[PDB]
Structure formats: C-alpha cells, structure tokens
Design a protein around this ligand. Structure first.
Ligand SMILES: [K+]
Ligand SMILES: [K+]
Ligand SMILES: [K+]
Ligand SMILES: [K+]
Ligand SMILES: [K+]
Ligand SMILES: [K+]
Ligand SMILES: [K+]
Ligand SMILES: [K+]
Ligand SMILES: [K+]
Ligand SMILES: [K+]
Ligand SMILES: [K+]
Ligand SMILES: [K+]
Ligand SMILES: [K+]
Ligand SMILES: [K+]
Ligand SMILES: [K+]
Ligand SMILES: [K+]
Ligand SMILES: [Mg+2]
Ligand SMILES: [Mg+2]
Ligand SMILES: [Mg+2]
Ligand SMILES: [Mg+2]
Ligand SMILES: [Mg+2]
Ligand SMILES: [Mg+2]
Ligand SMILES: [Mg+2]
Ligand SMILES: [Mg+2]
Ligand SMILES: [Mg+2]
Ligand SMILES: [Mg+2]
Ligand SMILES: [Mg+2]
Ligand SMILES: [Mg+2]
Ligand SMILES: [Mg+2]
Ligand SMILES: [Mg+2]
Ligand SMILES: [Mg+2]
Ligand SMILES: [Mg+2]
Ligand SMILES: [Mg+2]
Ligand SMILES: [Mg+2]
Ligand SMILES: [Mg+2]
Lengths: 55, 117, 70, 153
RNA sequence: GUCUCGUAGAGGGGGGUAGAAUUCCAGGUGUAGCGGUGAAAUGCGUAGAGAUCUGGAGGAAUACCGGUGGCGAAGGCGGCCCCCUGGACGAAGACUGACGCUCAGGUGCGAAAGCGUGGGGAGCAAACAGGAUUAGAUACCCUGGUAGUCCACGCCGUAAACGAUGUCGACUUGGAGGUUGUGCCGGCGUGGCUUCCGGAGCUAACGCGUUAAGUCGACCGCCUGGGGAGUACGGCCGCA
RNA sequence: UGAUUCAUGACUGGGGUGAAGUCGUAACAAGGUAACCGUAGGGGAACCUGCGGUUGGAUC
C-alpha cells in the first residue's frame, strides 16, 4: 500500500516540475495509480512534496 | 550608476508583442525594450525578428550597469520566446540559467469566450 | 522548466535543452488550451472524437499489414 | 511552368569582345529584332565610356554593373490570411538580368540627343552611384530592408 | 428478500482547509509606450502605465493524476481532510418460504435559463455603450460592461432531459479490450459492470447483433397524411 | 337571479390561400459565424447574443 510518508517512492511518480506522471508512461495498474495520486496530494499539503517546481 | 554584473532578464512573450526587462536579482528594473517600440507595428511587431531587435535595445539600455551574467525568465507563448534569448547571448552576456515562468491556473478564473471568426 | 547551464556547456546546447524541457512540460499546449473557455459539452465531444480516431485508425492498420498493394 | 522542363539557351558572344555578358546587354537593348542597330549603339556608348575613364570597355562595364546589381528583393507570398512582401535572395544570374534591364530603362528615360550618348551617361553615373538604375537598386534594397521581419515565410 | 465477512467508487448531505492563477489596493525599482486586430480604432499611459519585486484584500474554480476510467433511477457527481449517510458487488454458509413482475390516477426527484427574499460579487458576461467591418451591420471582430453565473431558503418542472431505443424475466455461434471481485497451480478458472468488431437471425435500407433492433412471455406509455397546431377556447397548476 | 347554447358587433390577434411588388439572405456545402433544443434578453424582418445540452457537424 502506498504511503504519503514514503517520499522516496513517491518521487518516482512525479516529473521534474512536480506533476504526477500518467500511468500509461510508468506502467502502473489503475487501482494503484489512484492510490498514488491520493498519496501525492496528501504529501503536497504537508509540504513533503512540492506543488510546482518553481518553489 | 552602481555596477551589478549579475542581473535577470525577463521576457514577456505574448502573441502580440515582446517585452524585455532586465532587473537585478531583487527584481529592481534597470532597463527595458519592447518589440513594439523598436520600429514595428501590426503584423511586424509580433515576429521573432522584432523580438530580437528589442533584446538588443534592452542590452544597450543597461550597458552602463556593467552586467556580465544573466538568468533568463521566459513567460508566455509568443513568437519571441527564443530569438530574444539568442540575441541576449550574442550581446555578450553569459547566459547562466534559463527558466519558464508561464503562469498556469490549477483548475482558476473562467477564460473569455471563444472567438467566432 | 529550470535549465541550469553547466560549466563549459555551450549556449546553443543549453538552448536546445531548455526547448526540450519546455515541450516535455506541455506548457505551450496548456497555455493555448486556456486562452478561451470550452463548454463542457465541447470538451466531452472532442475527447470522444480523439478516442474514436485513435481506435478506428489502429483497427485499419491491422488490416493494412495483411494486404498487398502490388 | 508546372512541369519544369525548361533548360537553357546558348547565346553567342559579342563580335568585338567575345563576351556573352555583353551580348545579353545588346539583346536587352534591342527592339524589333534590329540587332545590328543595337550592336552599334552599345559599341559607341562603350567607347565614350572607355575614354571617359582609364579602364577598357569591359572593366568600365563591370564597374557599372557592380553598382546596379541588387542582392535582395521582395516577392509577394499569399498565405493563410494575407500577403506579405517577403525578402528573397536574388540568384547570381538574375542579378545581371536586373542590372542590365534597369540601366537600359534608365537611359531610355533621359533627355540627351542620341541613345548612344544617353547610355554613356547612365553607364558613367552608374560608376559613381548616381542617376536612376542605381537609385532603383536603392529603392529595392530599402523595401527588402523594411520587410526583414518576414524572412522565413 | 434477511444475516455474516470483505472490496472498489467524482453516489449524497454538512463542516474545515491547501496550493496555482486572475482582479483590486499599497509600496520599491524603472521609462515611453501598452493593449488590441486581418488591418485598425475606441481604451489605458509622463497625473509614471505596461514590465518587474514585496506585502495585503477578496471571490470563484480545483492543473497534473484523467482514462470509448468510476459512481448514481435519471438530472448529474472531480483538490485534500473530518463527520453523517444511500446503493452496488464478491466468497462461503445460515435463514424466510412466492413474500413476485408491471402500473392508469397519485406522489417524489428533475440540467441550464428564469422568479421571490436576504447575502455575495474575483473572473466571465445576455442587455447596454463606444470602436470597427459593411451598401447597411440593431451581427460576426475589438474596448468596456449590468442582470446573471456564487451562497441560504422557497418557486418553476422544461431540454436533441438522446441510446432520438419503457420496465421485468427466459433463451440463442464468436473475437479483442477496459474495470472491479474471487478460486486454484506468472498459469488455469469463475462472478459483476463496461468499450469496439462481427455470425445466424432481423431490418425499407442504414444498421442491430447475448448490454438485440434476434427468439418469446407479463404489464404500461404512445402513433394513425402534411399544414393549421402542441395553437385557440375551457380546466388545473404557477408570483410571473 | 344564474347556467348553457346559437346569432351578431366598431375594433383587434394571429392563421391559410393566391399572387407576386418592396426589404434583406436565416437555412441547405464548414451555406461563408457548424446546425439544432430548452430558456432569457434584444432587434424592421428573416434572426442575433448569453447559459447549459445534442450530433441529426465539415475539416483535422
Ligand atoms: K460510502
Ligand atoms: K403515471
Ligand atoms: K468582457
Ligand atoms: K456587404
Ligand atoms: K457584473
Ligand atoms: K422553468
Ligand atoms: K447522447
Ligand atoms: K472481468
Ligand atoms: K480473474
Ligand atoms: K409505463
Ligand atoms: K415575479
Ligand atoms: K359574443
Ligand atoms: K446562423
Ligand atoms: K450545418
Ligand atoms: K439560444
Ligand atoms: K427599424
Ligand atoms: Mg480577446
Ligand atoms: Mg440556475
Ligand atoms: Mg427579469
Ligand atoms: Mg436570484
Ligand atoms: Mg441575490
Ligand atoms: Mg464582448
Ligand atoms: Mg418534452
Ligand atoms: Mg444529458
Ligand atoms: Mg449521451
Ligand atoms: Mg423522447
Ligand atoms: Mg455490430
Ligand atoms: Mg425496426
Ligand atoms: Mg399552450
Ligand atoms: Mg406548479
Ligand atoms: Mg446565410
Ligand atoms: Mg450559418
Ligand atoms: Mg416549447
Ligand atoms: Mg445583440
Ligand atoms: Mg459575440
């Protein structure tokens, strides 16, 4: 299960600018792509990850 | 009249015009030039060439400041995104950093209605 | 898109890189799409059309590797 | 043409000097197929020009050409919306064809006595960047200058 | 139909919060243009704009993820977090014992616009004004801009409210996918929902084709040449 | 004193038919601003504009 705290893994699924990478490019399953997006959005709110790269 | 050597070039590249503003590192403007004020109106003003002429004139307006190094911030989709940077390097400045700062709303306000031409 | 020109990197090489990082960010396509408002019925109509085109073209490609022209 | 099947035609060199370059200039000057009448006019103007300077008939002719040959011109280009006068590079052959045509046209407009004298005064001013023809080359370079922004259409 | 265990979900109602952007306000730097178009002009600017930096105010919408993806009776539903809450599906069993299907009248829900009262108002923008275009231009284009769009409560009850396809059940060759369960040893099964193609059959043809427009049963709604007309008059409903 | 029904009435509302005069050119092709639906406002007229919706849109 994906953890919003597990920042090291989450960084694999965001671009250099901070955007979530499409599942068609990373080859992620749909059910887990939805968990990644939720986790990434929680991490952004806690300032563990950036919203946009111009931070 | 104070030397700076380390400035920032801001390129405002809209579909109709190009504005080039050179500031120091704290946002204080030192000089500016625009494609529209460099002798081009109408369809000529919105070209990459007119943007290049504006980049040169801006480089001249700040030659007293002794600027040596430049970061470049590009903003907008206009045709003067690249010819202004090419001309800033040909002007003698050392282009240290290039960045896109085009604003993107994360939704934001409703845009104007589509044109029926 | 934050291209830091590294030492000894010629300017043209940095210029082509910044261009690459822009196109890979889709900033230009995103700005052009936000210039005017698109009605939700229009957005849905053109999302469906692009999927019908992606599909019906692949289905004809399969029928073009199993046929001779001469 | 659409099919692009147009090669090149050989032109005989002029009698007195054996220069194909000069023989074309006689052709541009000729009217009604009266070539000998044009050969005489060119030869007379060329001698007045040869004694008005220190150079031979040819070297004085080339110096006249070098000051009238255009390097860039404008051509129209109708694209999605309107038409822009795009500046285009003039190919080396068209440079000579335009230079000769403007000289002959300028000389025909003067008010001296004979055409041999008119051509002589134009070929002489062309050596000093004066008169028409040279001015026509200036007007073309200006137009192509004011449209340099359109140098990619 | 009930119970047990679990699963996915923009299903609903209430509250909170985050970041991007627009506008406005203040200040710093800075100086002659900006903005707009096919080209212009109206408009804005030396009373210092536009550009750039800092701080503040406020409203609305939630980039990427995002998908012929998901959920919902339909209308519809999209940041994140909490609270209240509906449905669906699956695996093993246990339980009730035809408790079912459909439905005139009735009742409820029902996009957008619109209406009432009280709020709110950034952006957008009917009406309106000016600038253009034009033979004219009550338009298309440009610069502005008010209702309205937003919130609470009430009304209205209509849409190409569409799959132009009523609901329920049974039966009848195939192929490739999506999505979500579950059994077994990536491999083999077995459920739910869903996209495209196509067989028989059907169809005026186009096409439909196990999610039927095929083969049947139950019940309901509806049609009967075009125009007049979904109009008049009357009734009921509505503040209009 | 009501109801209902028939006749009639200055004037007025739209409708049909004929005929073609005047004004434009809304639709059919991407019909030259894709068309149409509901609604609202505006306009000599066909109509135009806003908001949501449909494909019964050409091009790509
Ligand atoms: K729930
Ligand atoms: K009923
Ligand atoms: K506006
Ligand atoms: K006209
Ligand atoms: K308003
Ligand atoms: K209504
Ligand atoms: K539909
Ligand atoms: K399945
Ligand atoms: K399975
Ligand atoms: K029914
Ligand atoms: K009212
Ligand atoms: K009566
Ligand atoms: K129309
Ligand atoms: K049409
Ligand atoms: K309408
Ligand atoms: K009128
Ligand atoms: Mg606009
Ligand atoms: Mg509403
Ligand atoms: Mg009203
Ligand atoms: Mg109201
Ligand atoms: Mg109100
Ligand atoms: Mg407007
Ligand atoms: Mg109806
Ligand atoms: Mg609908
Ligand atoms: Mg639909
Ligand atoms: Mg119907
Ligand atoms: Mg089929
Ligand atoms: Mg049928
Ligand atoms: Mg009625
Ligand atoms: Mg009512
Ligand atoms: Mg028309
Ligand atoms: Mg039309
Ligand atoms: Mg109606
Ligand atoms: Mg109007
Ligand atoms: Mg309009």
């Amino acid at each position: 299960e994906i953890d919003y705290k597990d920042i090291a893994t989450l960084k694999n699924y965001i671009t250099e600018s901070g955007k979530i990478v499409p599942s068609r490019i990373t080859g992620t399953r749909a059910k887990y792509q939805r968990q990644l997006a939720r986790a990434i959005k929680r991490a952004r709110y806690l300032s563990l990850l950036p919203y946009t790269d111009r931070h | 009249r104070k030397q700076v050597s380390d400035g920032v070039a801001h390129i405002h590249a809209s579909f109709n015009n190009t504005i080039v503003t050179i500031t120091d590192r704290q946002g204080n403007a030192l000089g500016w030039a625009t494609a529209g004020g460099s002798g081009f109106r109408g369809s000529r003003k919105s070209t990459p060439f007119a943007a290049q002429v504006a980049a040169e004139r801006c480089a001249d307006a700040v030659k007293e400041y002794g600027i040596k190094n430049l970061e470049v911030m590009v903003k907008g989709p206009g045709p003067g995104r690249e010819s202004t940077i090419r001309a800033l390097n040909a002007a003698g400045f050392r282009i240290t950093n290039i960045t896109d700062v085009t604003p993107i709303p994360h939704x934001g306000c409703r845009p104007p209605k589509k044109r029926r031409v | 898109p934050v291209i830091k020109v590294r030492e000894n990197e010629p300017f043209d090489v940095a210029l082509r890189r910044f261009k690459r990082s822009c196109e890979k960010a889709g900033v230009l396509a995103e700005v052009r799409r936000r210039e005017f408002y698109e009605k939700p019925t229009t957005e849905r109509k053109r999302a469906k059309a692009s999927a019908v085109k992606r599909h019906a073209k692949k289905l004809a490609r399969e029928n073009a590797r199993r046929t001779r022209l001469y | 043409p659409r099919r692009r099947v147009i090669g090149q035609r050989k032109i005989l060199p002029d009698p007195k000097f054996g220069s194909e370059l000069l023989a074309k200039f006689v052709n541009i000057l000729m009217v009604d197929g009266k070539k000998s009448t044009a050969e005489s006019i060119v030869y007379s103007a060329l001698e007045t020009l040869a004694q008005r300077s220190g150079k031979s008939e040819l070297e004085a002719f080339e110096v006249a050409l070098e000051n009238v040959r255009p390097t860039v011109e404008v051509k129209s280009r109708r694209v999605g919306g309107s038409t822009y006068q795009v500046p285009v590079e003039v190919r080396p052959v068209r440079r000579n064809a335009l230079a000769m045509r403007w000289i002959v046209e300028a000389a025909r407009k003067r008010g001296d006595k004979s055409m041999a004298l008119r051509l002589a005064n134009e070929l002489s001013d062309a050596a000093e960047n004066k008169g028409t023809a040279v001015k026509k080359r200036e007007d073309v370079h200006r137009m192509a200058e004011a449209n340099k922004a359109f140098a990619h259409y």
